[PDB]
């Protein structure tokens, strides 16, 4: 998947 928030 994609880079998530911290």
């Amino acid at each position, epitope marked *: *998947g*994609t880079k*998530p*928030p*911290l």
Partner: antibody
Amino acid sequence: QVQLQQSGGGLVQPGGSMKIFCAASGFTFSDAWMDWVRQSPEKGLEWVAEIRNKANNHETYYAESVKGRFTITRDDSKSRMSLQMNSLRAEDTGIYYCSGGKVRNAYWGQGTTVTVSS
Amino acid sequence: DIQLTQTPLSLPVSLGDQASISCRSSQSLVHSNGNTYLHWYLQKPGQSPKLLIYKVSNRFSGVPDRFSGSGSGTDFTLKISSVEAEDLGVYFCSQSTHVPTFGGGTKLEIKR
């Protein structure tokens, strides 16, 4: 109570521009992960664009269908975001929902319609 | 892409009975960080969508525990025990593991 109130929708010529807005209350907006999601018969529910946390530097991302035409905007001090649209197409026609929260898609507004027609 | 497919299209159910809804993803929703971003929503007539369940099985605040979600990888189910009238509407699943995509929805009809 949390409210997301969309505004600014209406009729636009193909090729034209339109800004819609979402006013938030009842939660700490700078903490909130926000989305625009549109709905149409010809496509059902469609993610359009997102704008992340202050913590996450208000990072934006756009659906590929609107990349380059649409600009998402936010003001934490005024608990408001917008979607500024250009070169609108018939296919952009739909109900545009404002959605967000600490948990993401936690809350949804009643939506505002965007109709692209001559 | 990742298409999510909902099944069945409509579901009639008598009050007090259990309803079961399925949502398959065109691929695994398991993220590189071990999390599975699979959410369920209900759109009642005339209203916008409302979060029911996030990350597979976590009830968002306010959601009655008659609503329950389970599943792994590409296979997910929403279960609604004790169906009440006010449950009718369209149930949607969406995934946000990848670029966010939504299911086609499943209409819950109340047998009368």
